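During the second year of the project, the team shifted from modelling isolated chains to modelling whole assemblies. The rationale, set out in the original proposal, was that interfaces cannot be judged from single-chain predictions alone. As a representative example for this report, we include one of the complexes processed in the last quarter. Its constituent sequences, exactly as entered into the pipeline, are reproduced here:
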Amino acid sequence: LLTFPFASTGLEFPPVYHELYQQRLTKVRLPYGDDAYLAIRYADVKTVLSDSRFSIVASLGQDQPRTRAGARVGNGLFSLDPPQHSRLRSVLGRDFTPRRVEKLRERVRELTDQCLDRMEAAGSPADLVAHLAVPMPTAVVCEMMGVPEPDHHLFWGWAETILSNDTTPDDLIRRYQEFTAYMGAMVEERRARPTDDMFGMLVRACDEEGRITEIEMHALASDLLSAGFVSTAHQIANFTAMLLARPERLQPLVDKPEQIPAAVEELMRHVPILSGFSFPRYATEDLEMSGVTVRRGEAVIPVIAAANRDPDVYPDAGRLDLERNGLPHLGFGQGPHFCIGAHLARVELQVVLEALTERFPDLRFGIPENALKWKRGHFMNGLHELPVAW
Amino acid sequence: LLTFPFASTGLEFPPVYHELYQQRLTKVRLPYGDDAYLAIRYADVKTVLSDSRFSIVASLGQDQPRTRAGARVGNGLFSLDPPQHSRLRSVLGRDFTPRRVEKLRERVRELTDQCLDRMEAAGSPADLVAHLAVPMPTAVVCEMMGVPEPDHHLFWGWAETILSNDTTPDDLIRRYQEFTAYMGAMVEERRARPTDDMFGMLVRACDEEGRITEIEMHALASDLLSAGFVSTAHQIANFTAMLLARPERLQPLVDKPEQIPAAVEELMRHVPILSGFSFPRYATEDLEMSGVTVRRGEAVIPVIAAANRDPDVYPDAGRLDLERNGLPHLGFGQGPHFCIGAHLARVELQVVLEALTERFPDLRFGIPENALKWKRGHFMNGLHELPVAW
Ligand code: HEM
Ligand code: HEM
Ligand SMILES: CC[C@H]1[C@H]2[C@H](C[C@H]1C)[C@H]1C[C@H]3/C=C/C(O)=C4/C(=O)N[C@@H](CCCNC(=O)/C=C\C[C@@H]3[C@H]1[C@@H]1O[C@@H]12)C4=O
Ligand SMILES: CC[C@H]1[C@H]2[C@H](C[C@H]1C)[C@H]1C[C@H]3/C=C/C(O)=C4/C(=O)N[C@@H](CCCNC(=O)/C=C\C[C@@H]3[C@H]1[C@@H]1O[C@@H]12)C4=O
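Output from the structure prediction step:
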């Protein structure tokens, strides 16, 4: 069988996908776990993500297809199907609706401004990863949750552990133990002095209203503080690097600031954020997909980066066209597990581009593009550093 | 209770939504059937359409909230929840993927050109509704299914019965009898001799593969010949009118054809196609929506038109901006029942704007704007006629 993931470096999209688009659904071998099919057509990835005949739960003795040594297991949102998944997420739902997140726009800009004050002070050329991509989205969720600045580094360490392909089940226990200890102390603080932040809301959801158990309270906290900043950090960097590699760099968005939202969406579509893949889903019954009968219990991987370059949905898919305004990309997923933070990410990315265009309109690479240190072996594509000059 | 639908005329967005968006989920009373909540925020209409806790089936004795006198009931796709819905739909799925539908672009343009030849031959001013909006999408699906041209008028009549608010269960009996008779004949004919058309595919699905039963084959065919062209017909005229009512008319799209797909999407967002509403959904368990506890069994109506002008999703929502390339609209719906024809409709609307810009760049209203005969009190908004000049 073909082995997956395929060879690529940086944000490269590998040419093998252009072969597979026109073939039937193909089975691949993965680094750990059972084999799986590769959903790469737009409609197929949509199906895998959103159709009730695909379960995110391995209930028929499957060995989870994956790139990480330890199978991804827990009691939080990625471990549940609807309706259980739906009631649990609805504990967070109302804090991530556009109507709520839109109110954060100002604070996001403020934090972004502080970061850039600090970058400007450091002087050209500076590492935009260290000065902006890491700090800003981390502050955003940590102050949303109620985690003090000085502990941010702990949550980076736990999130890298989740995301590292070389993490073992032991490594995950160690994480679980450390994280539980941390939040447990935070729970006790909030019980004695209640706070208005999200963790406070979670503690009340548990203690007062009896809406969730302690296990669910911790699980949701773990999900947000794990999923909630490392992805945006990687994208802040990926997005700027994509833009600076263009002859005109930021100038189109300097000239036409009203096109920044569209630009954010095109980049969401075009950047292959993952060198791995997310959760496989499993057929709850036999079903047909791209010329193949997928049997009950068999795993299908949703390759969202291939979806976002489907030749039939997106003409000239490999071209970054910031005016494309393409059909709706799958970069935040689809169906039940559609990114609960999708609007917050869009706000964070719109705000980063606003602030860079307004403050550093002549922003450019601070080293030769050829010297950029892309992450090589990692679950997520991105940059170790992004030196920029102004 | 607040009565719904709200007063509006033509494609006017009624101002009352600007009130309701700020407020908690509100309950309305309908022309027929039980009362229901009005889902109007983006995220809420999404939930209603996509969340498994919302069923399209009244399984607890409910009287379907509606504007039509006779309740909407049958054996096709709008009468099913997943997975039963999913299994029936999958019989058609393959034929409506973008990969399949993109192959129809040539033929859709051919038919659009024939329509425009007749219009031009009729002479300025001419009615674009009669010459293009009605014939072209009717011909597209009927020839897809294998229905001959001379019989198109019959399918228009059956479709309007379904869509007319003044239709009784008796009128629906007549329709069903007439329609079943007609497709029965088509079935005999396809059984006596194979044809490579969509109805012929349904016949193979019933007779040869035993995938579906005879009344499901009929249902599916009825769904497609009912939903499959009156909507596109109404939008072709709605879209053209929207464009012709602006100072610049068609010139922005003449000048930049590459923006035609984006305009189609903005129009889909902006145009309130329904005066009424689609199917209500029923909560299958207690849940929270916009500050209200929706109890099990209670109905919630997804108001697509309102979601598409959600003030927090869409800044300045009332403005038709063809470059907006906004966050994805709910105009083709969402979840299980997301329009099976969405790509075909995008193809049809794109091709119509391509053909109109290329052939009639100085297209303009053929009568004074205030004379336009907008449909009054009908289920869908639109024009009885659209005189155009060139
Ligand atoms: C550019 C940044 C981001 C990207 C590209 C992204 C992408 C995604 C994708 C594709 C999924 C679904 C994976 C699957 O279905 O297998 C997901 C889920 C999730 N994301 Fe995001 N995300 C981003 C930012 C955020 C933010 C800012 C937050 C929270 C503050 C967040 C929290 C979550 C959570 C909790 C889930 C699981 C939701 C569920 O299973 O119900 N993400 N994200
Ligand atoms: C501008 C044109 C169109 C618009 C605005 C439109 C809109 C919609 C919407 C919003 C729904 C879902 C309603 C709900 O969930 O309550 C739907 C369903 C449906 N549409 Fe379309 N549609 C269009 C064109 C078409 C075309 C061209 C076809 C051709 C086959 C078609 C066939 C269907 C069918 C069969 C369903 C039911 C699907 C299901 O329940 O699984 N429609 N449409
Ligand atoms: C750029 C977007 C990427 C996403 C990525 C998929 C990509 C599209 C998911 C993959 C999740 C793995 C999760 C995971 O391995 C586990 C696990 O081992 N146990 C549980 C409970 C442990 C605590 N919760 C979590 O850590 C929950 C989410 C963290 C990540 C999350 C990242 O945001 C980035 C679980 O969810
Ligand atoms: C602008 C788009 C509009 C859509 C509209 C909702 C809007 C968003 C739906 C509403 C459906 C009503 C359906 C309906 O009344 C019935 C009924 O009475 N019996 C069944 C079986 C009868 C045979 N199937 C059908 O007629 C199936 C679809 C036709 C319409 C369909 C039109 O595309 C237009 C049924 O579905």
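The first helix of chain A runs from residue 16 to 20. Chain A has one domain: 2-389.
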